[PDB]
Structure 1
Amino acid sequence: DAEFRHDSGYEVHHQKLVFFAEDVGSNKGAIIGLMVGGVV
């Protein structure tokens, strides 16, 4: 699973976009970073 090959150089450097959606779906109060910008 997750056999992505969105490797830049000969591709866009917006490797953030993917997670920026997948993480929302797999929400967890963003505790994974615990510094998202809303830790009360």
Structure 2
Amino acid sequence: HDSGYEVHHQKLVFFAEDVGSNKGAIIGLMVGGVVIA
């Protein structure tokens, strides 16, 4: 991310609450790789 030299208080929040059915992908934070279906 923001590489720099110094990073102070950082707070991330990712979620998914009420999913009935899921046949695909629910990804929070994606930086690389491959995700199929």
Query: Normalized per residue, which structure has more strand?
Result: 2
Identity across aligned pairs (percent)?
Answer: 100
Cα root mean square deviation, aligned: 8.2
In the alignment, structure 1 segments of 5+ residues that lack a partner are 1-5
- Relative contact order (C-alpha < 8 Å, sep 6+): which is higher? 2
Give the number of equivalent residue pairs.
Answer: 35
With structure 1 as the length reference, what TM-score do the two structures score? Answer: 0.14
> Where is the helix percentage greater, Structure 1 or Structure 2?
1
- Answer with 1 or 2: which has the greater Rg: 2
Q: Which runs of 4+ in 1 moved over 4 A?
A: 6-12, 16-31
Unaligned segments of structure 2, at least 5 residues: none
